[PDB]
Amino acid sequence: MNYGITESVKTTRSKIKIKDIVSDVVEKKANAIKYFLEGEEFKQAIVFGAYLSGSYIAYSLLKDCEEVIIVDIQPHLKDILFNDGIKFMDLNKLQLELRNGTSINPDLVIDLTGIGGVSPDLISKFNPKVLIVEDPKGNHDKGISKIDNTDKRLCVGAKKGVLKTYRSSKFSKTSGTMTLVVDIIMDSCREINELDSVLYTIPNLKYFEGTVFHEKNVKKFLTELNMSAITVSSIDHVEYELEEILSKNISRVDSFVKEFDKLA
Amino acid sequence: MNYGITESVKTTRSKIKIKDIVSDVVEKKANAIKYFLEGEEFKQAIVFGAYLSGSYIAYSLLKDCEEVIIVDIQPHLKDILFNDGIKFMDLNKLQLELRNGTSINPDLVIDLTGIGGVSPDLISKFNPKVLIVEDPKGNHDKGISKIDNTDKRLCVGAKKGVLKTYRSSKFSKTSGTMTLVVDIIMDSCREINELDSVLYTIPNLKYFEGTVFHEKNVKKFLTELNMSAITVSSIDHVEYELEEILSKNISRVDSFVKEF
Amino acid sequence: NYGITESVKTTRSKIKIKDIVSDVVEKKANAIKYFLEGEEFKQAIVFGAYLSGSYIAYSLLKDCEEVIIVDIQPHLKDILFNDGIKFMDLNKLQLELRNGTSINPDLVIDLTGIGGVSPDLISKFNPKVLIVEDPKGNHDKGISKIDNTDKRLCVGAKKGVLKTYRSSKFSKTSGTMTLVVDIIMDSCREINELDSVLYTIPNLKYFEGTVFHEKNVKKFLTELNMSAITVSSIDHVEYELEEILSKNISRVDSFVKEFD
Amino acid sequence: NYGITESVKTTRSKIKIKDIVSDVVEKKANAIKYFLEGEEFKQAIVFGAYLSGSYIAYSLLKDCEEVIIVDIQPHLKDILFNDGIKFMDLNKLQLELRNGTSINPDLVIDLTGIGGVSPDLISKFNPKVLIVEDPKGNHDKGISKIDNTDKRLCVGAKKGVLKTYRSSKFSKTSGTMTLVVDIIMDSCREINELDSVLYTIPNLKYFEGTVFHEKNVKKFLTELNMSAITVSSIDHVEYELEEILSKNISRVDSFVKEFDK
Ligand SMILES: Nc1ncnc2c1ncn2[C@@H]1O[C@H](CSCC[C@H](N)C(=O)O)[C@@H](O)[C@H]1O
Ligand SMILES: Nc1ncnc2c1ncn2[C@@H]1O[C@H](CSCC[C@H](N)C(=O)O)[C@@H](O)[C@H]1O
Ligand SMILES: Nc1ncnc2c1ncn2[C@@H]1O[C@H](CSCC[C@H](N)C(=O)O)[C@@H](O)[C@H]1O
Ligand SMILES: Nc1ncnc2c1ncn2[C@@H]1O[C@H](CSCC[C@H](N)C(=O)O)[C@@H](O)[C@H]1O
Ligand SMILES: Cc1c(O)cc(O)nc1CC(=O)O
Ligand SMILES: Cc1c(O)cc(O)nc1CC(=O)O
Ligand SMILES: Cc1c(O)cc(O)nc1CC(=O)O
Ligand SMILES: Cc1c(O)cc(O)nc1CC(=O)O
User: Which residues pair with D227 in a beta bridge?
Assistant: First the structure.
């Protein structure tokens, strides 16, 4: 900790970093999938969508899956991959290998693309034992519900599930990792600002999605996540309360896979 | 605007930049002082505190003062002045010139230092026609009220005034330019996020004060203010609502000098 | 018109609590109507008379030869406003199911929600259409744990889940009472920020207590006749008051999600 | 204790509206006491009986030989709970000032606020201490325009402005009623976010109407006996309910700002 303009004001940066919030949310999504799979083993798993939770989710499936393949429409996202054991395939390469080849016949398909993502037509080409589709919808919004087609994507699999992620007692427009991280920080700032002696509270946010998809720079994106989530200007010490508010907001994240019953 | 991850999601950056919010706030504070002065002319004006509103306030005072001197405890803040007509003096040079010299005898003294700023003892050494002290307090906070000594600073001047700045119907901990800018952006984000089709809203904020006082880099600080105040991810267009919400939150800023 | 003195105005909203209740129950009834696609039924059974059940049963009289409301509380027969709707307490329905053939509905609607109808009772029917109201609103761990909506969708050739939310706003349940309270509370927050408003009063009380503890439907209906909000202000706010309330009422979105 | 069924709990707060009112009036009375520094007075005049005036006038009985409450509404004599407090309506005070020497207070306290006593009436006194309650809370252009607190501080050797705010929270005025309503409304917002809560009811009504329109102080006092909040939830929330209310009551800060010269 340091001082601000003069020694009468303190500047406190949270120990909790943006990457720590991202890690907690992705781990909750990976654990939801793990719980839903009930320790079942698979020959080949295909995970659509590398950013932002896909990387850690694919890595978490290596223990029970002989082969894990991440599929992404953006080839540069091979850089966001967690481990060498995860195979990366461009959408162009997958489509080609499906038409002319027998190497692709997964028993576990996980769709994490969400809004404007994979089409139900591509999903229908598979015949897995388990199909998991991530529902990008958070709390109610007409515009988001209209563009969402999660139900149409659950067209294959003996066992089907929908990965849902919300914040308990708080409003979020989507279940997206980025949306949730931003909402956790924003909600923490509003409460932090009400602590006695606080002058102002800064959420250290920027359009991180732009660094990944517009600048096509995964390395820079990961560096940007290394910043303290919040910076506070105050007369008195707030370091304790600052981590407790952030932690409380991170703990509200609840992720689970809802099983979709289809008897045939 | 542009698209986000796919063409199904739009990315919109506000036309309103952080510098535009800063400019609106500083102009409101400068206008409050102008309205309070009622067109009175002065031989020498001394303004304590260059950052953040002081620079524009001193510039605006050249219309009514023969000489305008910005005084700051940080010598590198001479870089935040944008007009050569504004004279700069660090606190030590001023204190020395007061003891051994007659060149300093202002008829207009403006204290914008706020929390942990200029002591009432230094203010008591002047005998101006008008004294304006900026109250750093915003809405009620016990910790901030305890450290504040604005009333003790109003110890000289034939006419005395307290520059106050608040947000109508909204809570702000201080009247500081930076505090107001941050609160305007944060409150705008809260309302923008509730617009139909919005996925998430990003306030493009950072600890700008750090760039000025810790990195001692005014140039970099000014470059950082060129960023769009808010970035929005949405399914539908939100261009108008984005600017209208930020505009509405900037309009809530009310600055005025209360005469004592 | 005035408050303590003639310098302050007292404004009571033209929108009454009953008007908010009516709008919500009509949205739920319309969601069911849209989902039914004009299909006609010989016998409809609706579980849960309070609070939307009464109007929902009334709206089924056109396309249903017989509409029966079932409630665990016999005094809730008083909340029905049309003699064409038959009433049966839960014990009477259970008796008639064991010893009788008069009950064999082609349309079953469960509106009991939390701690309501058991899936075991629902499993005794074989209708053409089954509609179960999901009491869950936005995410809450405690509410999700007690909810068993999915287990209740165990019969019917066509199955649907009635869902009700507030667009861009948080609500713990889809319950009529919850939504009405939330609409009023959110309206108060925005009304209080209007210029010149001193304070805003939501005219609320534990209405559920009048119905289930005092067992007085008549008194409950009389209590809903109150203006939703009372405002104390310096200037006129009548227009803004009705606009803020209407806007919050319009966020209610009700629909039946078909379960394939 | 249960709601519609035994699966849902109904909890009424132990804290009653009267308890919130009492805490706010006591904070205002204590602010005045601190400011007076134990000074004794021959005659104190307090303008405005509702809502904090009654308890403030009561707290002045110890250090003042005579305490007179002045209210434009004669029925507000019913809100006084001690016979030691003399009551005079505005008309009687105005008559006694013109034709009489019985009124010459050394302590004048104006609690009328918005549309209250005129500076012209205040200027007719020459007390040792003058305290004017500032009705303004946080910033609002409309309230600021109608407010004339500064013009009311025209007499007294020692002058003070009674200010009351909520730390870190927005309130349009310093009025007892406004603060009570805001404490309850803010508590409801936080209570509703507790896990398992279905909905939260603030037990509010236009209490001011009972006092000034129905002219019924007795009924108004009875209406304050109600629990401040009623909660519907799946799990127990009794302790959190009380903690959030107490926390919001504790944010009230009242103090008299001394006006020099
Ligand atoms: N048709 C398609 N096939 C494969 N990947 C796709 C796709 N459309 C989009 N994607 C990828 O899927 C991701 C969409 S972003 C989804 C966010 C994610 N559910 C989370 O919560 O973190 C991006 O990596 C994008 O490049
Ligand atoms: N004793 C002193 N003399 C002169 N300048 C001082 C000072 N103490 C602090 N300052 C300066 O005054 C400023 C304090 S920041 C005040 C913020 C300003 N009122 C606003 O709203 O924009 C800084 O520029 C700091 O360097
Ligand atoms: N097992 C059961 N059988 C029939 N009715 C029941 C029941 N359990 C509860 N009820 C009734 O169903 C209602 C539950 S309250 C449900 C609120 C309603 N969905 C709304 O939004 O308005 C009450 O009328 C209650 O008495
Ligand atoms: N000119 C006047 N003289 C005396 N009393 C007046 C007055 N105008 C209004 N009043 C009274 O003063 C009170 C105004 S309400 C003020 C609220 C009070 N400050 C609080 O916080 O509780 C009412 O009792 C009203 O009848
Ligand atoms: C959830 C989601 C999505 O499915 C698609 C997209 O482009 N953005 C988001 C928001 C996010 O990534 O948080
Ligand atoms: C108002 C203020 C101040 O007087 C002193 C300081 O160090 N910080 C602030 C906050 C700000 O600049 O907004
Ligand atoms: C939704 C709901 C419910 O299913 C059961 C109960 O007891 N209360 C509510 C809340 C309400 O009526 O709004
Ligand atoms: C403060 C105040 C006032 O001075 C005059 C009035 O009519 N209403 C209020 C509001 C209140 O009593 O809370």
Answer: D16
Give the SS3 label for residue D23. helix
Backbone dihedral region of C216: left (phi > 0), alpha (psi from -120 to 50 degrees) or beta?
Answer: beta
C179 is in an annotated binding site: no
All residues at 6 or more sequence positions from C51 whose CB lies less than 8 Å from its CB, including other chains = C21, C25, C175, C176, C177
3-class DSSP assignment, residue C15: coil
Distance from C-alpha of D224 to C-alpha of D221, rounded to nearest angstrom: 5
Q: Residue C205's Cα: distance from chain center in Å?
A: 17
- Residue pair C32/C259 in contact (Cβ under 8 Å)? The answer is no
Ligand 5 atom nearest to A134, measured from its CA = 4
The partner residue sitting opposite C167, judged by closest CB among B169, B170, B196, is B196
Residue showing tokens 């105050």: A234
C176 touches chain D (CB under 8 A): no
Q: For chain D, how long is the longest CA-to-CA vector?
A: 71
- The three-state secondary structure class of A106 is coil
Longest Cα–Cα distance of chain A, Å, equals 71
The Cα D47–Cα D112 span in angstroms is 6
Q: Contacts of residue A196 in chain D, CB cutoff 8 Å?
A: 167-168
**Cβ-proximal residues to C214 (8 Å cutoff; 6+ apart), any chain:** none
Residues of chain A with C-beta less than 8 angstroms from the C-beta of C141: 168, 254
C170 shares contact with chain A (CB less than 8 Å): yes
Closest CA to B183 of B192, B174, B195: B174
User: What angle is formed at CA A70 by the lines to CA A256 and CA A103, rounded to 5 degrees?
Assistant: 120
Nearest protein Cα to ligand 5, atom 4: A114
Let me know: does A138 contact A118? Beta carbons within 8 Å.
Answer: no
| CA dist list (Å): B100 to B15, B96, B123, B222, C124 | 51, 6, 17, 37, 102
- Bridge partners of D88, per DSSP, are D70
Which residues in chain A are contacts of D195 at CB distance < 8 A?
168-169
Technique used to solve these coordinates: X-ray
User: Is-contact D29 D52, C-beta < 8 A?
Assistant: yes
Q: What whole-number distance in Å separates Cα of residue A106 and Cα of residue A158?
A: 13
Mutate to test the interface with D, among B133, B140, B179, B254 (most CBs of D within 10 A): B140
A164 three-class SS = strand
**Strand A42-48 with A65-72, pairing:** parallel
Angle between helices D176-192 and D238-250 (to 10 degrees): 140
Touching partners of C (3+ C-beta pairs < 8 Å):
A, B, D
Helix (H) or strand (E) holding D252: strand D252-259
**For chain C, what percentages of helix, strand and coil (3-state, to nearest 5) are there?**
40, 25, 35
Closest to D251 in 3D by CA, of A194, A191, B115, B168: A194
**Selection from C178, C155, C175, C72 nearest residue C109 by Cα:** C155
As a whole number of angstroms, the distance between CA A65 and CA A43 comes to 6
User: Is A136 near ligand 5, meaning CB less than 6 Å away?
Assistant: yes
